[PDB]
Amino acid sequence: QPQAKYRHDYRAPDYQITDIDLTFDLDAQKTVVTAVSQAVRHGASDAPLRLNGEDLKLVSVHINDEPWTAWKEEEGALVISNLPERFTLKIINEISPAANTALEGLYQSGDALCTQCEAEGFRHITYYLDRPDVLARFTTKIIADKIKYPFLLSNGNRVAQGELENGRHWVQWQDPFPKPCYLFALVAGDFDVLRDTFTTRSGREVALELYVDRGNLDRAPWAMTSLKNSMKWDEERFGLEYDLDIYMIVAVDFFNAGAMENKGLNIFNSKYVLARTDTATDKDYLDIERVIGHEYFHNWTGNRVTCRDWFQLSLKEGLTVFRDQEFSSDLGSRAVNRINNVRTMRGLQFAEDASPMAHPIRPDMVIEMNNFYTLTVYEKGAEVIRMIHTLLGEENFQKGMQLYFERHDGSAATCDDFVQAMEDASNVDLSHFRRWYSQSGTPIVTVKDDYNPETEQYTLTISQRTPATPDQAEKQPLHIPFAIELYDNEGKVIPLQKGGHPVNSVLNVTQAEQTFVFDNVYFQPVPALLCEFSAPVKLEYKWSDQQLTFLMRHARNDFSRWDAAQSLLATYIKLNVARHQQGQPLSLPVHVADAFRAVLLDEKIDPALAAEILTLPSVNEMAELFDIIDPIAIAEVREALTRTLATELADELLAIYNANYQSEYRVEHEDIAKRTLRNACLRFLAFGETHLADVLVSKQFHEANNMTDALAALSAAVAAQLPCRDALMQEYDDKWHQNGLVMDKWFILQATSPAANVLETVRGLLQHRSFTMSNPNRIRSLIGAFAGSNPAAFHAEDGSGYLFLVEMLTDLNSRNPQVASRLIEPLIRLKRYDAKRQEKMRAALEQLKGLENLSGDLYEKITKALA
Numbered sequence: 001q002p003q004a005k006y007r008h009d010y011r012a013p014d015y016q017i018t019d020i021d022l023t024f025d026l027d028a029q030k031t032v033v034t035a036v037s038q039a040v041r042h043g044a045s046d047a048p049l050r051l052n053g054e055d056l057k058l059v060s061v062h063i064n065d066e067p068w069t070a071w072k073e074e075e076g077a078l079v080i081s082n083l084p085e086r087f088t089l090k091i092i093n094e095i096s097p098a099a100n101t102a103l104e105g106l107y108q109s110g111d112a113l114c115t116q117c118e119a120e121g122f123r124h125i126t127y128y129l130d131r132p133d134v135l136a137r138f139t140t141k142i143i144a145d146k147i148k149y150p151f152l153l154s155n156g157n158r159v160a161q162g163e164l165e166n167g168r169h170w171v172q173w174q175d176p177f178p179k180p181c182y183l184f185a186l187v188a189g190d191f192d193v194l195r196d197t198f199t200t201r202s203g204r205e206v207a208l209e210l211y212v213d214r215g216n217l218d219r220a221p222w223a224m225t226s227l228k229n230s231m232k233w234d235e236e237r238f239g240l241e242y243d244l245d246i247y248m249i250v251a252v253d254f255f256n257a258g259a260m261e262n263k264g265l266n267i268f269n270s271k272y273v274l275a276r277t278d279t280a281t282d283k284d285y286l287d288i289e290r291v292i293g294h295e296y297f298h299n300w301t302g303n304r305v306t307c308r309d310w311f312q313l314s315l316k317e318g319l320t321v322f323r324d325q326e327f328s329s330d331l332g333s334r335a336v337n338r339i340n341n342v343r344t345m346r347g348l349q350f351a352e353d354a355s356p357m358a359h360p361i362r363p364d365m366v367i368e369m370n371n372f373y374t375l376t377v378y379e380k381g382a383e384v385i386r387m388i389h390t391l392l393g394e395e396n397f398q399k400g401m402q403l404y405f406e407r408h409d410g411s412a413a414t415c416d417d418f419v420q421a422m423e424d425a426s427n428v429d430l431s432h433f434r435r436w437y438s439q440s441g442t443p444i445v446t447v448k449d450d451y452n453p454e455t456e457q458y459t460l461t462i463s464q465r466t467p468a469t470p471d472q473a474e475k476q477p478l479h480i481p482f483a484i485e486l487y488d489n490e491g492k493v494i495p496l497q498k499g500g501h502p503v504n505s506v507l508n509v510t511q512a513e514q515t516f517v518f519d520n521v522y523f524q525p526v527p528a529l530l531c532e533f534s535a536p537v538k539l540e541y542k543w544s545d546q547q548l549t550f551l552m553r554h555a556r557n558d559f560s561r562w563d564a565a566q567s568l569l570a571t572y573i574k575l576n577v578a579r580h581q582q583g584q585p586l587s588l589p590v591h592v593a594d595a596f597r598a599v600l601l602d603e604k605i606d607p608a609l610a611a612e613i614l615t616l617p618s619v620n621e622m623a624e625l626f627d628i629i630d631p632i633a634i635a636e637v638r639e640a641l642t643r644t645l646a647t648e649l650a651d652e653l654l655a656i657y658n659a660n661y662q663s664e665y666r667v668e669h670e671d672i673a674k675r676t677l678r679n680a681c682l683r684f685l686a687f688g689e690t691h692l693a694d695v696l697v698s699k700q701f702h703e704a705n706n707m708t709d710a711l712a713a714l715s716a717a718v719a720a721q722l723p724c725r726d727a728l729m730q731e732y733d734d735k736w737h738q739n740g741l742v743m744d745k746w747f748i749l750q751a752t753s754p755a756a757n758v759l760e761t762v763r764g765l766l767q768h769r770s771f772t773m774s775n776p777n778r779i780r781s782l783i784g785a786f787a788g789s790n791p792a793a794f795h796a797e798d799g800s801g802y803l804f805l806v807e808m809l810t811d812l813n814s815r816n817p818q819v820a821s822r823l824i825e826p827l828i829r830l831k832r833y834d835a836k837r838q839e840k841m842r843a844a845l846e847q848l849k850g851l852e853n854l855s856g857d858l859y860e861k862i863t864k865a866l867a
Ligand SMILES: NCC[C@H](N)C(=O)O
Pocket: 118, 257, 258, 259, 260, 261, 294, 317, 373
């Protein structure tokens, strides 16, 4: 019975709230909330005010200080009748932070109290218009025990404070910017604080404050550094300054998301704040940078301009993800960023778009809005903004940004508003392009080519289609920007032209079928196609091995070198999965191995690139290549391929490994790159002769002067099941058990182990001293990693994986439905698998469907999967 909501139902609110004054009398067992709201009727004069509320204990309702009699509580609501046109609403209610295991609303993180209000969490704090087109100026007074909660934080600036009898105190905050309530935050606790300053380019000095648990101040400076780098980049790239006087970040251990952009008071999962060279990898450092940037970039793309309704989520998320990618790419290695974002798109997002949960980047139907914080809305959303940037170019893109803020600053906007701004500013017609917002699924672009030596013309015949998805039976052609480059046989770019005029290298692929003709092609070209993954599409073109190795040697853009290597491997991945299914061992032509040898020995390739080419597609990227997924064949082919290259390239691998040794550890992009190349080599070296490999891996673990190098060694010992594995794993447990973020990496290694008894080990780990089901990070690192990242064990033929997940979800459905819904995702992909697997996955899903008190979050997914 939880009911679907539809985008086409959107209507302007009958009432607005312009100003809200909140008081919290804080206590873990019983918090008393007083909320005084100034309301204004915009709808019909007989329309009742309908407030949203969940798990609230209503104490009183007054209208202009009169105790109100004309109201009723109903499921999820408080409905107030017979109101004047303008009035003051006062609600007093109670809530219980300590009972809040779902971590939405006001809840407890360790000894702290903190909030999470996006999407619809504020209704768990008081009765309100909990929709993001209602924008109110907040004032927030917090009263609490001074010893337990010496810091009392909310949005904006401190405007008042006092002390009270019996050891209590209070602080009052005011945020001058109107905001939807999903941006409300409150934090109370006892913290260490790192304080710093950023001066904006126009000279405004912003006080920066990072609040962390006592004892964690040694892990704070990188996050502070990254915040300042974020603020500077946004000024340089987008012309945007911070708009308040104080920027607070609180790191908390118990958090369902990564982080949250609450105005002036961001709340982060401490996974995305805390780093020191002995605890955090280069990947953690760069994720901290990325997510600090992301929440900062929301200050404009989300906060100053917000979302009219939740179906417009991608208006803030695709754009803010695009911004975080551009930040990471400008500061770091653009190629490595782009590569990794492409791997995520093709390996994880394409899977979602082929699943029962498929939706467009602007959904049409939602049951539980927390189910739509997706790869699609985020990552595909950003690919869509990046297509706009491709079509318009940077200068016009920025004009469209400027026009967007000039029109929409201080309001709640739509995806369509943003596109209109881009189109009006640039004079590029985006009417057809808008179909990317409304249509789900991955287009498949098929390319055929012809060279005519008599006319000296190269003709590309490009076709597109998007297969139907369970949500949409009709699909139509998109406006696909399809970037090409043509190479002569010495590797020089052939100028693109037709009838004597230059032709843009971004082709407009707008029809089901079209041709593009290029003149003055004097010699048969080798094409690079879909350069920089210029659209989020599958490409079907029948490359020859030699065209691909030529691109690996000659392509001008680093991405194209990587991508060519991926197309080279895809053919042999597919070959060998079919072999595996018939009991046949790996077959790989000599010339393929040699193309990777050449990358190893090319001194002119950026190590950052070499490293990515020498990182094989993950099991998730390998799965995208197939209609039916054989997860056992894929996992075993991936290892066999790794062993084959390890044997054929052993000498070269060892030389490059040794040459990329660095005695100093720095978090600097060139150092990171060499280290990534080094550790790429290591993955293969772990599969050499057992005694060479065991010694080398073990040595790296024991002599590392940083967590990047130690984890890469530990991870190799696991992957190759080397004799040192058990000892190294026990040493890490002994050294690091008291540190959850660091033990997350060990839990992931256990969960993703190729060992025959992995499931047994993972079950035993539910009792490990560093694990608990009350913490979403731990849950995700052990259970979520087993189910989502070890598809070979999760899909064991005996069905033991599915039973284990059902067991875990039966607990989490009641405890924390959002983490439950993340964890169910592997089960909903059942139609990608063989019949016998499907049958057991359906049976698991039918069991979950019958749970008492089945959460809406799971219900929505289970219903789609079982259809
Ligand atoms: N689930 C993440 C929530 C937040 N609005 C962000 O974009 O990072």
